[PDB]
Amino acid sequence: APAGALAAVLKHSSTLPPESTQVRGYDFNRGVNYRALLEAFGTTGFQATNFGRAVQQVNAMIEKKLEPLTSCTIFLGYTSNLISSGIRETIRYLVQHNMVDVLVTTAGGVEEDLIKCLAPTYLGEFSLRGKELRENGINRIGNLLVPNENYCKFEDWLMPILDQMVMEQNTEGVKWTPSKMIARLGKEINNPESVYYWAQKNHIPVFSPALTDGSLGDMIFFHSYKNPGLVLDIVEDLRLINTQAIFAKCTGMIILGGGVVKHHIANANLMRNGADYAVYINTAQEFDGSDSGARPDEAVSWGKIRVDAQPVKVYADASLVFPLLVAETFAQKMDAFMHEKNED
Amino acid sequence: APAGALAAVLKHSSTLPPESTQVRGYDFNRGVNYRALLEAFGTTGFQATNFGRAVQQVNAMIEKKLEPLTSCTIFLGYTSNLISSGIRETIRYLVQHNMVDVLVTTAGGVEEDLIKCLAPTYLGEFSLRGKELRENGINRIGNLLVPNENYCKFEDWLMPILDQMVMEQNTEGVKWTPSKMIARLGKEINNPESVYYWAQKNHIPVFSPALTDGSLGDMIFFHSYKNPGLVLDIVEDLRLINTQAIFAKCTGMIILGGGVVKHHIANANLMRNGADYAVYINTAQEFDGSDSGARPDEAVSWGKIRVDAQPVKVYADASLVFPLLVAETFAQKMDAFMHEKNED
Amino acid sequence: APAGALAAVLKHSSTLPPESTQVRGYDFNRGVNYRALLEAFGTTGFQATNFGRAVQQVNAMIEKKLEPLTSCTIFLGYTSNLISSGIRETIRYLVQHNMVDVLVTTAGGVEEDLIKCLAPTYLGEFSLRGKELRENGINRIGNLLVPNENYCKFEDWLMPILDQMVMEQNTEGVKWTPSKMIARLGKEINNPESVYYWAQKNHIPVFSPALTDGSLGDMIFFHSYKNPGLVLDIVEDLRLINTQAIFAKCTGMIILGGGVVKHHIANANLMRNGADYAVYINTAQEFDGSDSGARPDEAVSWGKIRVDAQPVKVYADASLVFPLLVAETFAQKMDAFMHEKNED
Amino acid sequence: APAGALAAVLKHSSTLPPESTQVRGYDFNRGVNYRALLEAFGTTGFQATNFGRAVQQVNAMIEKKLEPLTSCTIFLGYTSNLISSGIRETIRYLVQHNMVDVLVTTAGGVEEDLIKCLAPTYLGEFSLRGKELRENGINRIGNLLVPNENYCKFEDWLMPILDQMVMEQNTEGVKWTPSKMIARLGKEINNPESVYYWAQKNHIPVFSPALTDGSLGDMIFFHSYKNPGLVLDIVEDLRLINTQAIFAKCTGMIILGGGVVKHHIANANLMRNGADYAVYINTAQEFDGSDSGARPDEAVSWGKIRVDAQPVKVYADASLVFPLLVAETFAQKMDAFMHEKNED
Ligand SMILES: NC(=O)c1ccc[n+]([C@@H]2O[C@H](COP(=O)([O-])OP(=O)(O)OC[C@H]3O[C@@H](n4cnc5c(N)ncnc54)[C@H](O)[C@@H]3O)[C@@H](O)[C@H]2O)c1
Ligand SMILES: NC(=O)c1ccc[n+]([C@@H]2O[C@H](COP(=O)([O-])OP(=O)(O)OC[C@H]3O[C@@H](n4cnc5c(N)ncnc54)[C@H](O)[C@@H]3O)[C@@H](O)[C@H]2O)c1
Ligand SMILES: NC(=O)c1ccc[n+]([C@@H]2O[C@H](COP(=O)([O-])OP(=O)(O)OC[C@H]3O[C@@H](n4cnc5c(N)ncnc54)[C@H](O)[C@@H]3O)[C@@H](O)[C@H]2O)c1
Numbered sequence A, B, C, D: 001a002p003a004g005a006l007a008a009v010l011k012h013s014s015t016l017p018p019e020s021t022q023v024r025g026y027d028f029n030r031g032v033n034y035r036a037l038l039e040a041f042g043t044t045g046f047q048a049t050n051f052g053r054a055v056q057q058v059n060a061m062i063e064k065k066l067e068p069l070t071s072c073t074i075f076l077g078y079t080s081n082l083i084s085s086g087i088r089e090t091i092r093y094l095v096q097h098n099m100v101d102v103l104v105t106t107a108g109g110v111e112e113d114l115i116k117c118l119a120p121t122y123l124g125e126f127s128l129r130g131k132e133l134r135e136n137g138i139n140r141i142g143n144l145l146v147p148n149e150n151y152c153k154f155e156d157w158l159m160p161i162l163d164q165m166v167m168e169q170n171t172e173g174v175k176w177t178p179s180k181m182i183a184r185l186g187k188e189i190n191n192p193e194s195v196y197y198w199a200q201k202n203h204i205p206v207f208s209p210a211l212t213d214g215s216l217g218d219m220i221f222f223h224s225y226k227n228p229g230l231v232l233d234i235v236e237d238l239r240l241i242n243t244q245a246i247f248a249k250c251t252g253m254i255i256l257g258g259g260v261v262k263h264h265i266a267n268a269n270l271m272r273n274g275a276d277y278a279v280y281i282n283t284a285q286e287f288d289g290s291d292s293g294a295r296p297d298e299a300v301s302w303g304k305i306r307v308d309a310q311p312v313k314v315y316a317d318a319s320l321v322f323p324l325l326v327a328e329t330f331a332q333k334m335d336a337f338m339h340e341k342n343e344d
């Protein structure tokens, strides 16, 4: 056998350092111990390991937070479609129990939470044809379906509130911004199944710079014809979110998906020289030079994440991962949260 | 041989209809005929075919447009990172020659165009480490590098303009919105290498609902301390873009990337019951239920694209595809555009 | 407000049919009921729903199978890297308990199972640099590390077996094929942590057409110098796998990843006019025209999946999903499997 | 304005080194200079830059090669679907002009080249439904269509050759392997539109370890019933490809797609301690720990690519990129290749 070929393939190696963790997956011969099965992800490799790490990093934020400012200001960001999904329940739970501090989502993430209190979203298929669906008035979101009548009901619900908002603006001197509007819609919906009803109740601000990009915008638009004048200033909202990071004793970022939501939270944290913790769960890739697909390490170069931080990105659809992440972090600490509220 | 196995594999088929196009790639034995090579993409299959179709659909918008309203209002949308890239040149060219009608980009897409007139962006590597880059003040965007001193120069340039903007607001009664601001920055830069200098010159509105999500926002934020009061209303901008679609004789959508940009243009077109043409070039996928990754057919179900339209999505990085698309469409019709301006 | 704009956005819709399932996510207010949490995935949307469906379809195969042929011949296919990961444990479990009938993996999927009995694989990072790793003799697989000394130990272990294999070929008249070789390596390893030790014990054939593409191949190659003559015929293996599908009373396909593995199983099932069940968990996409990324519906057009079947593809990294899928299917039916073996 | 916020955002940076290349895209004001437009990709950023680099690295292999061994042994690997596409023409061109040295493709990549000489492949749509297509006997490959009658014609063509192959094996003592078989099919087809007709003519070996995974396999399978005995040994083929790398004065790897093809070529090059050049064009991603999606740097850690080499991966669909890459490399050097053949 050729010497050079042998030497290249049979290259010797020393042993790995003692601290080295072995790849080992869950052993079903033990039966189904879910907690152990979930912890086993950490040593399974690839994204499972990243999920194992995410759990560890979210638990660090929490522990830190449990040490009105708190010991750690957690920013929760999520894309609109995630509110279209069942993750709406997951998010509402965190908000309901005051487990997070700031929320940021896109227009869809706001409106669809309120509309779900008016009518449901249904399961459909990615393959459903647009033409046939349009002829029936059915809007498709992935493999989900939103009957257009939901938006017609949304209008009936929203319009009178918009009458009042423009009224307050012009007589009571109210300066509306996306966050202020969202807090108002949340109080109006007055439904415990709503994320914004709880955010409003627990004084958790919700930022959404492009609140006009969706149904709410459609309604504001049509309403402006009979009632012009409504102003939504995004500048004051910039101030609000930014000072939230600046005056934080410590920060953690939990971001599902990318886009404006991901960037907005990271930019707020740049104001304090970087977030202390960061866990992302998104499907975007770096190859196209996009922000959405950028690895956390890129954020480090900008100063958005502390150089000493240990950000974690799980490359996966958050509809499958977020509830598992919550099961092993926030849901395990319920009693701990209640404790700080003097309820346990 | 088993009868059932044979029947299943050797299933007979009739011939395909006459109109059937054969898969055939460019034959280099002809030498390098670029135009023929590019047209050959249409019969190459996969995304090449989609590129072939995109060329056909963009040429349809144009031809239609060449029949102040025009015969076809073209909406050009692109993500921020694409302005970070060399596609800035491509986009400026279209805008400079009044080849498109409405532009929509995110905060980064605005600011980075102006900053590139102050200092350049450099080539780097995706692999460059955040820590080391941060210690040197270098911001990483994909495999591109933006020295932080660019932003320090941006501040020096921008601040005095912001002084004037708040001044005009409070004495001249100016109501600022993202589009109005962008048009002003474009006039101020006063540089032919700028996309917004030309947009401003050719009266092409630029919408960006979340203009606060970036450096401009950073600057507005800091500036608000010495000079509070600046208001950026996104509502009037909703009206402007929406009526652009509503009063269009016909519309075409050319969108690079996804996010707010993609959704905002499609929602404006919903106002007229759908765009007549739509060509997208983005890397997003549908599996996660995201808007960005949604196939054009999903837009059809919403009414954003006409049922009779023939939208085309090229799954590719637009930095590699957009200049080819422009070479075969807009760039081939230069004389035709000049003609309508009475210059040829 | 413009009539046409209103009509387009406020389009009425009838209600969805009664059979319509509402999107609803798990409610953590119930505490952490893992089983309920996992079932809730079905109504969460996007890939979670696809996971919910996958569970249903894998449970259908099983139930059917529990009605030497069995009532349903299950083909389990997986890529090499999945054996590098902790999914090696998951796969061994299924094989150990005779829960599946045919296995198909690539060269890496075979060799790395045996080597893990000689030395472990470690956790590393995707970011680890090739140069530095090579200078230390460490091979990188994703965020996993395989010290090259593992392969040096592999050689010491394998060589004497190869001496015997060529010997048997030439004196005992043995006709070697990948499956026969794999069964032999499995008996030789004689370790209960091995997938192939169990496959061999439970008479579960393992197909791997390109068994030469890896370390085993490296070793066969070097060994052929001192001992030429070894022949690995892939034709007889084609016959074996094909008749497995042809003479099956019913078939189900569980495929993790794509490539040869995915195609080989689907082609075997074409021999019986299609698989009755098919569940895939892979990250590939259709846009590039690849087999790996092809949706199950494409397989239907070929006759690889029955038109009446209900294939399910979960777009996700199987290291995170496969153990959950096993927890809710095979692991829930342990007693049922033991029953058919007259052990419960 | 908060001092800490200012300092974090307005962090100063020194200038980048002189050797720093500025991001600048093609300027269409110059008109359409295709060559310049293509070179401009190098400074456009993201994958365009990677394409610019790919061109540079493929031109380096060539130049080196132009200095029966040659000064650089180029391995060309491509997935099956790429032969289904128009890239079949591109590949045949390189092979026809003896521009590459070794080819490696999967079963589909072999058979579909031959079948295209019997009947064409057509353009279809990714959206075409499997059921309806199956009822008509039409096989779908991405947005391409292969009427099943093509395979029925394939059988008529192939069978008599298989009769002869088994005959030669048993009387003439021929030891068949995938490469030997492919060379024979190539001579039999006797058509200049065929990749394998030319490979056979120019003595360019074609490796395909899993040649049984497709139609050829289907035919071998059925044929084995009337004529059993055919043996396809993959071991000798391992030797052939491996020594090709071992005895090369220098090597370059051009790989389209991933899977067995990509790994097989890289493993052959490990035998000489690594390839000197490597250019990949594939859509796979690293997150799932797959080989296909592994960055070239991972190959460096294994010793498959020389530490001093400069591998390049273009993240894109090769149907759109490969013809451009060929236009700027091989096609520009036609006269140079003819020269070494004493024809110019
Ligand atoms: N339901 C909807 O999708 C909906 C409804 C109304 C309006 N809109 C508008 O669309 C625009 C764009 O939407 P967006 O900014 O929320 O993001 P998006 O939906 O466009 O997604 C941005 C990125 O987030 C990631 N992502 C999405 N879903 C994910 C998931 N399930 N798991 C992991 N990663 C995921 C993807 O990588 C994607 O590239 C917004 O302005 C929004 O208001 C969307
Ligand atoms: N240069 C930057 O990336 C930059 C700079 C400053 C601020 N920001 C902010 O980041 C936020 C998100 O950025 P965004 O909304 O512009 O989008 P994004 O960069 O987050 O990308 C959204 C989607 O567009 C697609 N995409 C991106 N590049 C593409 C390309 N090269 N070719 C084809 N498809 C492509 C991807 O699929 C991605 O999922 C914005 O609010 C923005 O202002 C970004
Ligand atoms: N550990 C290794 O990666 C390894 C080791 C030795 C040899 N090899 C060789 O590499 C060649 C290619 O490997 P392969 O055919 O096994 O496939 P691959 O690893 O190249 O992957 C093929 C496709 O499977 C999918 N996939 C991979 N991991 C997945 C996961 N974690 N979850 C969901 N989907 C996933 C991806 O979509 C990918 O496009 C083979 O011939 C093999 O023997 C690989």
Ligand SMILES: NC(=O)c1ccc[n+]([C@@H]2O[C@H](COP(=O)([O-])OP(=O)(O)OC[C@H]3O[C@@H](n4cnc5c(N)ncnc54)[C@H](O)[C@@H]3O)[C@@H](O)[C@H]2O)c1
Residues within 6 Å of the ligand: B046, C258, C259, C260, C263, C284, C288, C289, C290, C291, C292, C293, D078, D079, D080, D081, D082, D084, D106, D107, D108, D109, D141, D210, D213, D214, D215, D256, D257, D258, D259, D260, D261, D281, D282, D283, D284, D292, D316, D317, D318, D319
């Ligand atoms: N036409 C076909 O697809 C076809 C036909 C018959 C048999 N098969 C069989 O399918 C099995 C798998 O096919 P394969 O190994 O050739 O690979 P594949 O088609 O499964 O693809 C493997 C990886 O290559 C990449 N890839 C594919 N097309 C690409 C492109 N257009 N541009 C850039 N990257 C691309 C993808 O990332 C994919 O993950 C093989 O054994 C093969 O014989 C395929």
